Structures are given as C-alpha cells and as structure tokens.
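To the team - sodium ion complex, inputs and output below.
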Amino acid sequence: QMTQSPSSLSASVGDRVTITCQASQVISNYLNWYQQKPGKAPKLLIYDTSNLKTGVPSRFSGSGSGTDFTFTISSLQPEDIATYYCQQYENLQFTFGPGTKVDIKRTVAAPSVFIFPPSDEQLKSGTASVVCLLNNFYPREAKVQWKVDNALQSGNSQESVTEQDSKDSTYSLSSTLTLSKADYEKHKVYACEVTHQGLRSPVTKSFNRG
Amino acid sequence: QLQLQESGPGLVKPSETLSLTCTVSGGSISSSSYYWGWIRQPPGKGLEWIGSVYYSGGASYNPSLKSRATISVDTSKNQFSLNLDSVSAADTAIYYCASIYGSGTFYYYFYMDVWGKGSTVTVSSASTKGPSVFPLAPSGTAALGCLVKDYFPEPVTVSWNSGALTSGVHTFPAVLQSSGLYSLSSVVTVPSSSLGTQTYICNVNHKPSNTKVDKKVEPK
Ligand code: NA
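Output:
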C-alpha cells in the first residue's frame, strides 16, 4: 500500500519539481529514491530519506519523516526525464513505490519527414515494407496517413515512437506500411501525409515505385 | 568500482525453470557489508524484489515468490544465481541483479547501490527466431536506417559503424506485429554530402538466436 503522487507529470525545463511518497507504515529502515531512465536500470540517487549518493547532482534532494516523504528537483534539466521510485524495507521485504514518470513540456517543434521504399532484398522474399520517418518533433501527438495512388490506407500500418530525447526533449516517430510484393507492384505512387501542430498544413513525402 | 552483469537464456518454456546468474567484478562477493539481490520488472509495470542472499548462503525472499524462487551464491566464481520454478507468462520480465549495502550496529539498514543492466526473459512455447535486416536507403541532411524485422523474443541491439556513429541515432521501440513477431527500425541522420562516399553499416545483435548481422546501407 505504498503510494506515489503524481503518477506522471509534464514540467518545463527549469521548473521546480516535487513528488511525494507514502510508505506503507512508519519506517524503521531506510527510505530510498531511485531514478530509472528509459531503457536503463534503476539508479540510486537518495538514501536514508535525504542523503545524496556521491556523484549525484545537488539539484536532487529528499526529505520527510514517518510515512510521508518528498523528492525534489530544484531545477529540471532535459536529461532528468525518468521514472522516479521510492523504496522501503519493512517486515523483511524490499518494496518499491508505483513510481512517478517525469517528462518535459517544451515549445512546439515541426517534424522533418522522410520516406523509404522497400529494399530489393525484402522484395525478393515477397514482402514490401514502406517506412515513413518523422524526426525530432514536439508534441508527441502526430497524424500519419498513408496514400497509395491517392487511395487512403487502413489496417496495414504500425507506428512506433521514441522516448523523449534527453537533450532537446523532442520525439521521433516511424510508421511502417506493409504489403505483399504482389500488392506493392500493383501501384505506382506511395505517399505519406503528416499532420502536426508544428506545421501550418500537412506535409507529404512520396516516391514512385521503380 | 563494483560492477554486476546478468547472464542466462532469454526464453523459457511454460512450467519450466528460469535460471539466471549474476557475475560480480571490481570486488569480492564475500564482503560482509553486502547482500546480493534480484529485482524484476514486467513490461510497463513497476519493480518487484524477488529475494536476497548473504555470501555465507543465508537467503531472504519475497513471500509471494518464496515457494518458487531459489537464490544461491558461488563465492569461488564470484557469482550469485536465481532459479525460478514453474514459470508462466506472468514471469516475463526484465530481471536485474543488484548489490545491497548494509550497515548499522543496533539495526541493519539497507539500500541498493549497484545494479546490473538487466536480462530480458520471456516465457513462451514458441522457438527463437532471428531477424531479417533490411536497409532503409536515403534518396543538407539525409536520413538512412535499417529495418529489423520478424524476430522473437526481445531484445535486439543495434549499433552503427561498430559504435563509431552515435549522433542523431534513433532506435525505435519494437512493435508487436500481427504475426506475433517483433519488428523495429533504427534510423540516423547524416550530411547528404557524405552519401556515396562514406560507408554506413548497422550492426544488429539478437542473442537468443545467436544472430549477428552487419548490413551496409547504400543510397537510392
Ligand atoms: Na503519495
């Protein structure tokens, strides 16, 4: 019954960030705080409620007592995007809090769009993957529409979005259109139309098969 | 300093036994001030401590996993291990080994100061499948990349020019395709001038299938 609040937050670079933890009972052992950046293992930042581990930047701090604890970032930096976990050891068990995800809000930024035809090697195997790339944009929200000879596509594309960049706080997005080689060869114009709040009007990148 | 590294298979069949080993370097596992633990993290979920072992063999477990979990220590090889019996899909997770620092006179105080990089374990009846790697060919900034398609289980790692190229690299999260296999793309942006003169190669590694592929990406 540990809690952490909020579950997630979007803050501007330079903002003071304060997150809270409730232990399941009045603590006897250490209350510790861990930082887990995307794709990484958790890293100890604060131990015994308020002690910074050696090497940890002074902008991080912890405080509290009893059951109520606080973790603070005095001035949020772009590389601080992570999930932050509090941790108790009581009744002979390590227990981690639910975690608080910290991400950054920044100004709108337009995507750079690129389109890739299928490789000839893939085509030999009977499948065609057409990939559209939206690079370094903000916010995360974006609309990608595939058009094949001006026919709108449905049910044959998947999207993936990167974690927020640790330097410029932007996102990138890939959309992959997958067709059989047979279907791919039945059409000429392959286009991807990108709609995003950083653009005045939709941007289209396209190529001609062959 | 102290460094930990997990090792072991990434695929385990249902009802069978998950086995992992953590190798400790930069220090002895027989330190009286240290305990050695395992913590796991299911996809999109939080952290769950599994158990800990003291160098003399004494172990302590999460009660919800105690019946299936066994954690042992090999002081000779500077290693400690996790065995988890009768696995199901609920045991699919990234497994981290960690060092636990203890101190105190009247009370034992603990924190986890050093973590391994984590080992991805998937519980499945399916066999491993190595990916196909296809170039994403570029047509003052150009984008190029590689498509890593139809592999199982996670993860794959992608490098560019054996690690020589890191700036502007985006390796996307894998997506689960309708085929039940994973796919991902790794992309990078480079000066368009270098196209056709400089060579770009993606290095793809998929450990469960022992797949190591280097794919050159050429323009148009
Ligand atoms: Na809370």
